[PDB]
């Protein structure tokens, strides 16, 4: 919130800027939003239909 002094009067300036989320915390805050539910992707696994072994050592 700042003031500027023109010749006819005085004007107020309000600048509100929402900072984006970052994991590092330099460009914005570290904590994510309370509404954003970050869900990771499941890895592609192949179900084995034949029982095998991996004996080593």
């Amino acid at each position: 919130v700042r003031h500027v002094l023109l010749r006819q009067g005085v004007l107020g300036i309000k600048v509100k800027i929402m900072l984006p989320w970052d994991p590092s915390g330099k460009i914005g805050p570290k904590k994510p939003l309370p509404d954003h539910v970050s869900i990771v992707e499941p890895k592609d696994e192949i179900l084995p239909t034949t029982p095998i072994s991996e004996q080593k050592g």
Binding site: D35, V37, I39, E41
Partner: protein, 132 residues
């Protein structure tokens, strides 16, 4: 009112869609499973999401759920679509034929057939609904 919001419900549907094998019936198990798989900032939202996960899993164990894509139910739906019977119901030994249909088939090229049966016409013309 203990009504779950869209940030609970859509996230819970995504969790059950991606991790149907991991989740289960017990609240205190699949709550920790959702804590592991999903980045939830707050415990209250985590509990809401886990409770709606338990409720949708109860809905899945009861029957099919509309807004979900389960691999096993999709495979069952694909199997029921790809089910083919033994003999066709279109192949019939006796086919009922109305006399005006017999007249139009006679004026066409296929007048006499092997497995048709011309029936008597339904006498008494009362087919419309009474008014009012």
């Amino acid at each position: 009112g203990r009504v779950r919001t869209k940030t609970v419900k859509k996230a819970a549907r995504v969790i059950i869609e991606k991790y149907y094998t991991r989740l289960g019936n017990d609240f205190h198990t699949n709550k920790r499973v959702c804590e592991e798989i999903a980045i939830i900032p707050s415990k209250k939202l985590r509990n809401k999401i886990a409770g709606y996960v338990t409720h949708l899993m109860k809905r899945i164990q009861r029957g099919p759920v509309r807004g979900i894509s389960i691999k096993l139910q999709e495979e069952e739906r694909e199997r029921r679509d790809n089910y083919v019977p033994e003999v066709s119901a279109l192949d019939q030994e006796i086919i009922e034929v109305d006399p005006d249909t017999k007249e139009m088939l006679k004026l066409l090229d296929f007048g006499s057939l092997s497995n048709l049966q011309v029936t008597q016409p339904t006498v008494g013309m009362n087919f419309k609904t009474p008014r009012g």
